[PDB]
Amino acid sequence: TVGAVALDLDGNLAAATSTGGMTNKLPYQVGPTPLVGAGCYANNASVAVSCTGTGEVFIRALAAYDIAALMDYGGLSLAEACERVVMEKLPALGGSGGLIAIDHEGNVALPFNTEGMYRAWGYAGDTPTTGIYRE
Amino acid sequence: TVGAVALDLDGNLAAATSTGGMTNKLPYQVGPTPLVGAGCYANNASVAVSCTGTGEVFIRALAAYDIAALMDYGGLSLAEACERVVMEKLPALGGSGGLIAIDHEGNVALPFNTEGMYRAWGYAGDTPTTGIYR
Amino acid sequence: AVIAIHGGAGAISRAQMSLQQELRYIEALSAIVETGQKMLEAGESALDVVTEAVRLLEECPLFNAGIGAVFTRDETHELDACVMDGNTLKAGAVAGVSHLRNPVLAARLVMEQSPHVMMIGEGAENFAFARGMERVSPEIFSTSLRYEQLLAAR
Amino acid sequence: KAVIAIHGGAGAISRAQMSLQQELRYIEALSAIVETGQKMLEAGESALDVVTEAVRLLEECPLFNAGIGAVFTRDETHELDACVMDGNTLKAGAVAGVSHLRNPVLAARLVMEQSPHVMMIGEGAENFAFARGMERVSPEIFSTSLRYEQLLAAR
Ligand SMILES: [Cl-]
Ligand SMILES: [Cl-]
Ligand code: NA
Ligand code: NA
């Protein structure tokens, strides 16, 4: 699974996610990746999110939309919303993985509950950060 | 599209939706019905929802889960949440249709923005209500 | 303890319908909601109740699900269903199936006998067939009225 | 405040399993793709085009399980999925279970931009894309010896 989220100079948010799924999967099994609000979600009013992880739990938990709703309706900060989803609700369902999120204010979050997540981010006109292991 | 939602005597919520989709659909186009949080959602902590409508808008709007989130996180009543989703947000996206919802407290809503929705509901051991039109 | 059901929303026309025509739908909706109320009153689970209500709506040829499914551009039937258990937050869904009489029962099988949540097409069918669910021809879903609506929509 | 984030998947990435040279191949790919996105954003390209290109690059990068380098199914095939969503219009496009499209995210964007639909599946998604002039490929092009070795390891 791979993904990108971005906020542009016009204040637009967008998200994208792509995958080959789990090694040894049944053909015709559908994980979160192509499912709006599971693997991918963006709304100028809240957040752009791209998920990677235990597939089913991301669907059942609608992880990508839950970040947005926690922020939009619950008034959680991006950081609080990412902690709630990735560190509390996903583990509660036995879900492992993470996601990347940018909010309408340009805050960025790359939470994950696994040993690693291949990840990177950067402000336009700034130097990028990259990571693999837990920070 | 057809659906059911229920609260049992143990306080459990469940939802189910089934469809043949839009007349003259492309085969291998996917409406909300099989998409968790679009056509169907249930959580003992909030609501059970079954949707029917312009399919794409119910997906883009994640209508079934939005009821639950509007209630759980937004503190909206089932009635407020159903009004917000079916009467404001779906039309705002050019989406037409409705849904049925029961919350963990046994409140029931059957909102729709269309000319009709074939619907019924009833409390266990009480008489059922049926409807077609507004 | 409470049930609600629907048989779809849209442009259902009053000036198009007789009371006798309307009463066919009212009778079907009341009979299914009554079955669910009686199950709930007897202490059946929300999951069994919504499963059986949707099975009956599938069987009811007046509603666009199972028997009475609309026709695709190719004069075929492709069916979808979903079920979710609010107690476990487990879900099962089948999308684009043509050889399962009751997609909601297939959806429940995916929920109960797999972690997959959503299965599509031949995969969903093979999953159900491997667990002894019977294969049907999509011709069993066909009704004159939905065929007339296909010809109308073109 | 323009900004990009990318990922290449979360899991049991083992430090005792990896050489620094192996790690640097991932770091180099992540930095090149994030830098392309930053440069596009800085030049005023749209969030949608930015996440589309970043995910296309992650697809092409055989280190990551999407497009080239996709994991193998039980049947030693590849089946790919993708989604894209525009926060401005709340339009989305998605493809599930495609094997003959080089860049599933471009097929997802085709559904978003050139259909009134959100999600297409399997041969239907492929026939839709081919009819819009997207090239057909063999799923063999996605195959890498490393993902094959992980399949053999799992069974
Ligand atoms: Cl690191
Ligand atoms: Cl009425
Ligand atoms: Na039916
Ligand atoms: Na790749």
Side-chain angles (χ1 to χ4, degrees):
Chain A
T1 306
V2 302
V5 290
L7 172 64
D8 68 23
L9 287 178
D10 292 338
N12 296 312
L13 284 170
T17 311
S18 184
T19 192
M22 305 168 337
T23 285
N24 207 33
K25 67 180 176 171
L26 285 175
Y28 300 109
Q29 196 258 311
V30 191
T33 285
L35 304 176
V36 170
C40 183
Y41 185 78
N43 187 329
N44 276 9
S46 54
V47 72
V49 179
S50 177
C51 296
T52 164
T54 290
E56 293 71 10
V57 176
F58 281 76
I59 303 165
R60 294 162 60 188
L62 282 159
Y65 190 74
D66 206 32
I67 298 289
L70 281 170
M71 290 191 71
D72 196 6
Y73 304 159
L76 276 73
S77 69
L78 178 62
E80 291 165 338
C82 288
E83 185 64 19
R84 169 89 60 100
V85 170
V86 175
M87 303 316 295
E88 295 161 27
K89 298 178 71 167
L90 287 172
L93 291 182
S96 66
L99 62 86
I100 62 176
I102 298 169
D103 75 10
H104 67 95
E105 295 296 341
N107 298 298
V108 47
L110 305 89
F112 61 100
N113 64 32
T114 49
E115 294 182 350
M117 178 167 81
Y118 298 120
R119 62 196 192 277
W121 65 279
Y123 288 115
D126 217 329
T127 66
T129 298
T130 64
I132 300 183
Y133 307 105
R134 317 185 54 77
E135 184 204 11
Chain B
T1 309
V2 306
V5 290
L7 174 65
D8 68 21
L9 287 171
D10 290 335
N12 296 312
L13 285 173
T17 313
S18 183
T19 194
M22 312 160 28
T23 297
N24 208 35
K25 69 177 176 173
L26 298 163
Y28 304 109
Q29 186 254 313
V30 190
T33 287
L35 302 178
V36 172
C40 185
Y41 188 78
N43 191 326
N44 274 13
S46 54
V47 73
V49 179
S50 177
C51 297
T52 162
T54 296
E56 51 108 343
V57 178
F58 281 75
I59 304 162
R60 293 163 58 190
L62 252 215
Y65 191 64
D66 203 35
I67 297 295
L70 278 171
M71 290 186 73
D72 198 6
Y73 307 160
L76 281 198
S77 69
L78 174 63
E80 291 162 341
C82 287
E83 185 65 20
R84 170 85 64 100
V85 173
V86 174
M87 304 316 295
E88 295 161 25
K89 298 179 65 163
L90 287 171
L93 288 183
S96 67
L99 60 89
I100 63 175
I102 295 167
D103 72 12
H104 69 90
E105 300 216 293
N107 299 300
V108 46
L110 305 91
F112 60 100
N113 64 32
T114 51
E115 299 173 13
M117 175 167 82
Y118 298 120
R119 64 199 189 275
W121 63 279
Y123 288 114
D126 187 23
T127 67
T129 298
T130 64
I132 299 183
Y133 309 104
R134 300 214 61 99
Chain C
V2 56
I3 176 170
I5 65 170
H6 74 79
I12 307 148
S13 165
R14 170 79 176 170
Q16 162 73 354
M17 287 271 97
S18 79
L19 174 60
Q20 282 300 317
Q21 285 164 333
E22 292 165 330
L23 279 175
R24 295 305 83 79
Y25 294 87
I26 297 294
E27 282 148 6
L29 289 161
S30 35
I32 295 167
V33 81
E34 290 178 51
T35 299
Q37 291 174 287
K38 290 170 193 224
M39 288 179 79
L40 289 175
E41 199 186 355
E44 304 318 313
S45 69
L47 170 57
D48 280 343
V49 164
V50 302
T51 300
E52 173 65 10
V54 170
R55 191 193 63 82
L56 289 171
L57 287 164
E58 282 173 353
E59 291 301 296
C60 180
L62 295 177
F63 309 110
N64 173 28
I67 313 294
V70 295
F71 284 87
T72 63
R73 180 211 40 188
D74 299 339
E75 315 206 349
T76 67
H77 305 288
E78 282 201 311
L79 314 190
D80 316 310
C82 193
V83 58
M84 189 155 184
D85 176 352
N87 184 50
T88 65
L89 305 194
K90 283 183 87 7
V94 294
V97 297
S98 296
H99 307 273
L100 296 166
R101 184 195 182 95
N102 302 107
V104 71
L105 299 188
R108 172 109 172 245
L109 195 54
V110 169
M111 181 175 76
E112 280 171 355
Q113 306 290 152
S114 100
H116 302 308
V117 174
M118 186 186 182
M119 297 272 256
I120 69 169
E122 270 198 45
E125 287 169 353
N126 290 336
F127 179 85
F129 302 154
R131 289 163 184 78
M133 189 156 305
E134 183 177 302
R135 179 190 177 80
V136 300
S137 164
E139 261 301 302
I140 72 168
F141 301 124
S142 296
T143 65
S144 336
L145 182 70
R146 296 308 188 170
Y147 193 66
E148 283 318 302
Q149 290 166 8
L150 176 72
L151 263 51
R154 287 167 173 175
Chain D
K1 66 184 183 166
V3 56
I4 174 170
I6 67 176
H7 75 77
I13 305 147
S14 163
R15 170 77 170 162
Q17 269 185 60
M18 288 264 259
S19 72
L20 173 62
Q21 286 303 309
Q22 284 172 282
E23 292 163 333
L24 284 175
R25 279 188 73 212
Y26 292 99
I27 298 294
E28 276 144 15
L30 289 171
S31 37
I33 297 169
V34 81
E35 291 181 57
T36 300
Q38 294 174 276
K39 286 168 177 289
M40 289 179 69
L41 288 173
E42 198 210 325
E45 295 306 303
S46 68
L48 186 56
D49 290 335
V50 166
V51 301
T52 296
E53 175 61 10
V55 168
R56 193 192 64 86
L57 286 168
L58 288 163
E59 281 177 352
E60 291 298 298
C61 181
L63 295 175
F64 301 123
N65 170 30
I68 296 182
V71 294
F72 287 85
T73 65
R74 179 93 40 86
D75 302 344
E76 314 199 354
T77 65
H78 305 289
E79 281 170 11
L80 312 190
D81 316 301
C83 189
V84 63
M85 191 155 185
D86 174 2
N88 183 33
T89 62
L90 308 182
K91 291 173 96 180
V95 290
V98 298
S99 297
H100 307 269
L101 298 171
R102 188 195 181 94
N103 298 109
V105 71
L106 297 189
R109 187 78 181 274
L110 199 48
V111 169
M112 176 196 277
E113 301 286 0
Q114 301 193 29
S115 95
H117 303 307
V118 165
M119 187 181 176
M120 300 183 184
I121 69 170
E123 313 205 355
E126 290 171 348
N127 296 334
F128 167 73
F130 299 153
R132 305 298 181 294
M134 188 161 290
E135 181 149 320
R136 180 194 205 282
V137 300
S138 169
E140 307 260 56
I141 73 168
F142 302 121
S143 297
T144 67
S145 48
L146 179 69
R147 299 306 188 166
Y148 193 65
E149 300 322 313
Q150 292 164 1
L151 176 72
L152 295 185
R155 69 189 191 175

